[PDB]
Amino acid sequence: FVNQHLCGSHLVEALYLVCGERGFFX
Amino acid sequence: GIVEQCCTSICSLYQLENYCN
């Protein structure tokens, strides 16, 4: 992949991909 | 991190795997 420059929500979608279940950080 | 290492540059998938947990 290109591992794009991810402001606010774009970072949060890439997190949502990595995560699946546990919910992101915190 | 948050914003500055991603929105400004390139986090990387490993650092996203620091970011789910």
Q: How far apart are CA A2 and CA B6, in angstroms?
A: 12
Q: How far apart are CA A24 and CA A2, in angstroms?
A: 21
At position A3, the amino acid (one-letter code) is: N
Picking from A5, A10, A19, the nearest residue to B9 by CB comes out as: A5
- Detail the DSSP E strand segments found in chain B: none
Find the distance separating the first CA and the last CA of chain B, reported in whole Å.
Answer: 13
| 3 state DSSP class of A25 | coil
Picking from A5, A7, A24, the nearest residue to B20 by CB comes out as: A24
| 3 state DSSP class of B10 | coil
Q: Are B9 and A5 in contact (CB under 8 A)?
A: yes
Paired tokens of A18: 């990595």
Which residues have a Cβ under 8 Å from the Cβ of B11 and sit 6 or more positions away?
Answer: A3, A6, A11, A14, B1, B5, B19
User: Looking at the 3D structure of chain A, how many domains does it have?
Assistant: 1
- What is the residue range of A20's domain? 1-26
